[PDB]
Structure 1
């Protein structure tokens, strides 16, 4: 007989640690592990932090991908932070997922995220101004207009007061914003959404499991990027695609592959993780109603810490991979030049060596040095200011229009080692 709406999901006792998981039951290199309940996953990373803070795992092989060599998993905050801040040792080349890069993949996935400096920073500087706090602040009106309309439409479209948060708010809000920043016409936003979803959801049968489909999607978005870039070359617009085609690095314009890769990076990065932060945030407010109440009764005062706690809690990017350029030793584990190293942000963000009470979802948490946007340094998330603003506005519009919005079913969770995703989240309101 809990308070609230009759079909709301069960609440949880805030602060309860999950049971730790016997190490023999942990297989980071099997998709089956990524299908387990998030409580079991959290307890497994707790076991690793305790018993095997640096451990070795085989690489998963999604259909058509090349697994290649295995990887050393860094599950402690300090090691993820150290690796992030030493890119001369922990290189982002040749890939930031664990699979091997191939020439075929590099045509579409060869952006600055898989490069070291100086070339990485010369590419990043083409677009960095558009993502700075003061420039992102100027698009508050666009974020608010879109979020307000989406929440209003949830109400207008659903006489029964039941909706899917993902398709009706969390997905379409960041999609609109990044597509408008890129200069993509509204008629194509839903094609961009589907392409994003396949690129980042590959291996989940609800998204795609045929490598031919992954490659067709990659080629189609790459061709879309090229064609839009060609238009902007001839007639400039005040959009990021125009910035990309007009730029020079080391005195040369970007090639077609560089344009395609940069466009794909920005549009794919620019929507799915923010979508998932919003959905995980609504799930957390549903499980921890006292946190909802405290945010709703001081929205602007708590918003800066609340948004960061949602990102720490959700850790929308589970890991990033690096490749060693020289031998090292961490925690008595020798690792060799050329070895793959995986940085588990999801685990760093529960590390009791860094966080007081890591199992408490605390929207006032301060300080909150989470690694949800990475450990800092050269590749720190370009979109962090944009994501923070989108998350804040989405929750402010829910608070104002449907303050008792609550999840009514447990999420359908994306099957992924890389992205902590929710495919559907049914919600209701009064």
Structure 2
């Protein structure tokens, strides 16, 4: 043989569907299933869309978490879209992952993402201006500066022209941007990143498997948030932590649990999502060179559709969970008030009922109504404009500085049923 650099990973034939998987081999409530590669996972969701578009599963038991009741899995696009856009029926309270909430977890994790309106929107409005397209556009210079420096450093730091895309670009770019928006000093950004890596890596032995470590990390980032907030209470800065401590909701300042939970939500979401879009995007360019070539020869013209196709392809957030407030029926399956419902974005984003040629990675795809940022409505990804900009700038800086950058090993995949994570991705360039 194939054209390119000698140690590049194998290419793939674009558009090839994965074989469907016998349904007896599918166990969404076992971590072992999440350790299977993406082709088996993709074929398994294909089987569910065909044979059992709504299906019930026991909740995975990770050490120290309470599985509680199982969940109804929505794997079709139209059902995920519907559930997302009916929050009075599909509530975000008490939690948006499959496990049960506890008071101990809610101290750090009881943010607006696990609330319904009106309180959810009152909290979101504290920070929403900072994430609008017009305001995010004004930090293009900061995104460029850090991406350009990171790519240059890949070259300066690696005489052998081998690097890990995750630790050297995809991780540190979004980290810098969200932490600077929050007002966190640079010296602490890597400490924040280690904390969010553990929070959203729990169950993968390379990150953490001891619940005691998970709770110490949670306590430590909560304490960090509280201390920074205290500083900003006394001396304002033009940052989001200051906005949080200065705001009032229903006539009351936020409590220290509310501040900590809001801070944690923003840095976790900012640090544990875009990096995977970027890394899966480089993996895809490596597998599908004709797509790299077409984007590189018209970068600005294709960027809007290319970024969105990277998000559809990667589906960095695998699912979100809701809880029914009333009985419903979908596709002949009667679900009860109080039951958990899981929305599988990874599956919606391959649904043949909504996408022409879903197994084709097409950077010109238009339209592209993917649910990688969710189905829309009240909780639609706050960071979506920021993420799109982070992705577009990262790829532009790769294109300009090291246009033939390519993966040289298959990814080390995060063991997670929530985050489509890549821990490392070795790359090279000429």
TM-score w.r.t. the length of structure 2 is 1.00
Aligned partner of residue 163 in structure 1, secondary structure: strand
Deviations 1:261-318 (A, max 9, x none): 0000000101211000000000000000000000000000000000000000000000
Per the TM alignment, residue 177 of structure 1 is displaced from its structure 2 partner at its CA by: 0.2
Tell me how far apart the structure 2 counterparts of residues 100 and 186 of structure 1 sit (CA, whole Å). Answer: 35
Partners of 1:357 and 1:76 lie apart in 2 by 16
- CA distance, structure 2, for counterparts of residue 129 and residue 101 of structure 1: 30
**CA shift at 1:340, angstroms?**
0.1
CA distance in 1: counterparts of 2:113 and 2:284, whole angstroms: 30
**Deviations 1:331-383, CA, capped at 9 Å, x for gaps:** 00000000000000000000000000000000000000000000000000000
Q: Is the partner of 1:108 in helix, strand or coil?
A: helix
| Deviation readout 1:118-150 (Å, 9 max, x if unpaired) | 000000000000000000000000000000000
Deviation beyond 4 Å, 4+ runs, structure 1: none
Which SS does the other structure have where 1:419 is aligned? coil
3-state SS of 2:126 partner: coil
SS of 1:66 mapped into structure 2: coil
Match of 1:154 in 2: 154
Q: Deviations over 1:199-223 (max 9, x none)?
A: 0000000000000000000000000
For residues 407 and 278 of structure 1, what CA distance do their matches in structure 2 show?
12
Aligned residue pairs, count: 430
CA RMSD of aligned residues (A): 0.2
1:20-60 Cα distance to aligned partner (Å, 9 max, x none): 00000000000000000100000000000000000000000
* 1:31-42 equivalences in 2 (<5 Å): 31-42=31-42
- For residue 108 of structure 2, give the secondary structure of its aligned residue in structure 1: coil
> Structure 1-normalised TM-score?
1.00
C-alpha distance in 2 between matches for 1:169 and 1:81: 33
**Cα displacement (A) at 1:248:** 0.1
Please give the per-residue CA displacement for 1:192-241, whole angstroms capped at 9, x wherever unaligned: 00001000000000000000000000000000000000000000000000
SS of the residue 2:200 aligns to: helix
Take 2:271 and 2:163, find their aligned partners in 1: how far apart are those partners? 20
Partner SS, residue 423 of structure 1? strand
What are the equivalent positions in structure 2 for 1:404-415 lying under 5 Å apart? Answer: 404-415=404-415
Partner of 1:217: 217
**Distance in 1 between residues matched to 2:162 and 2:37, nearest whole Å:** 25
Q: Aligned equivalents of 2:184 and 2:273: distance in 1?
A: 19
Per the alignment, in what secondary structure is the counterpart of residue 188 of structure 2? Answer: helix
3-state DSSP of counterpart to 1:56: strand
CA distance in 2, matches of 1:149, 1:272: 21
Secondary structure at the counterpart of residue 151 of structure 1: helix
Q: Secondary structure of the equivalent of 1:88?
A: coil
Q: Which residue of 2 aligns with 1:247?
A: 247
Which secondary structure state, in structure 2, belongs to the residue aligned with residue 125 of structure 1?
A: helix
Tell me the secondary structure at the aligned position of residue 127 of structure 1.
helix
Report matched runs for 1:67-78 at 5 Å.
67-78=67-78
Distance 1:182 1:61 in 2: 33
Separation in 2, partners of 1:34, 1:10: 23
Q: CA deviation at 1:166?
A: 0.3
Structure 1 unpaired stretches of 5+: none
C-alpha offsets along residues 52-102 of structure 1, whole Å, 9 cap, x if unaligned? Answer: 000000000110000000000000000000000000000000000000000
CA distance in 1, matches of 2:292, 2:225: 41
In the alignment, what sits opposite 1:355? 355
SS in 2 for 1:107: helix
Alignment partners' CA distance in 2, 1:101 and 1:349 = 28
In structure 2, C-alpha distance between the alignment counterparts of 1:4 and 1:224, rounded to whole Å: 47
1:269 match: 269
Shift of 1:12: 0.1
Shift of 1:4: 0.2
SS for the counterpart of 1:398 is helix
Q: Shift in Å at residue 404 of structure 1?
A: 0.0
What secondary structure is seen at the aligned counterpart in 2 of 1:73? strand
For residues 94 and 182 of structure 1, the distance between their equivalents in structure 2, rounded to whole angstroms, comes to 26
Partner of 2:183: 183
- Whole-Å Cα distance in 1 between the matches of residues 48 and 98 of structure 2? 19
Q: Following the alignment from structure 1 to structure 2, what is the Cα–Cα distance between the partners of residues 268 and 348?
A: 24
Distance in 2, matches of 1:213 and 1:325, equals: 34
Q: What is the CA–CA distance in structure 1 between the aligned matches of 2:298 and 2:37, rounded to whole Å?
A: 33
Q: Distance in 1 between matches of 2:79 and 2:154?
A: 43
